[PDB]
């Protein structure tokens, strides 16, 4: 039993809700919140910009030190950093950005990072400003993640389409 509330159950391990991931994280304080990161951990917009804003830019400050030490992530890769005031940890995961021409096949690799954590609050990877089809992202999530994932979908119209089209 966990404290996630109001989710629709899609499969044994995948759950979905129309919610602002920032507000969900503040309420639940999950062990892991997933960020829709880029390889430079520049949290300018989308989910990343919103999460970082909610940390009063502390996420960005920590991220800049991480990059200065380690260099950029790989597309499809991840790193674990602090969750600041939102969660114990933030798993920064880089899905492919279609608006940069990146290979959508890397979306499966990106979701594999979730399997290193027993329970996560997450957005749909490569959705929104990353330009992928969110219906496809949900399919890859369900077919790749085996740990317990609670998906927050900001857009109510999109949430309803994801549910009604889910096979
Ligand atoms: O087009 C849709 C695709 C999924 C998404 O859910 C991605 N972006 C977010 N997902 C959850 N919480 C959030 N807060 C700010 C941004 C944000 C919405 C756009
Ligand atoms: Cl977005």
* Residue-range domain boundaries for the chain: 8-163
Residue 11 exposure: Cα atoms within 13 Å on the Cβ side: 17
Q: Are strands 14-18 and 8-9 parallel, antiparallel or unpaired?
A: antiparallel
Does residue 62's CB lie within 6 angstroms of at least one atom of ligand 1?
A: no
Solved with: X-ray
Q: Exposed (0-12), middle (13-18) or buried (19+): which is 14, by Cβ within 10 Å?
A: buried
From the CB of 123, is ligand 1 less than 6 Å away? yes
Phi-psi region of 161 (alpha: psi -120 to 50; beta: other; left: phi over 0): alpha
Resolution (A): 1.0
Please give the CATH topology (third level) of the domain spanning 8-163. 3.40.220
């Amino acid at each position: 039993v966990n404290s996630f509330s109001g989710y629709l159950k899609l499969t044994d391990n995948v759950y979905i809700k129309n919610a602002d991931i920032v507000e969900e994280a503040k309420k639940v304080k999950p062990t892991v919140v997933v960020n829709a990161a880029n390889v430079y951990l520049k949290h300018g917009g989308g989910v990343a910009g919103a999460l970082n804003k909610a940390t009063n830019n502390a996420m960005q400050v920590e991220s800049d030190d991480y990059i200065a030490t380690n260099g950029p992530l790989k597309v499809g890769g991840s790193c674990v950093l602090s969750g600041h005031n939102l969660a114990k940890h933030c798993l920064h995961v880089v899905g492919p950005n279609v608006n940069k021409g990146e290979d959508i096949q890397l979306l499966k690799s990106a979701y594999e990072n979730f399997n290193q954590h027993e329970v996560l609050l997450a957005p749909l990877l490569s959705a929104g400003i990353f330009g992928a089809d969110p219906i496809h992202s949900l399919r890859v999530c369900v077919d790749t993640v085996r740990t317990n994932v609670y998906l927050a979908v900001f857009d109510k119209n999109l949430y309803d389409k994801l549910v009604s089209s889910f096979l």
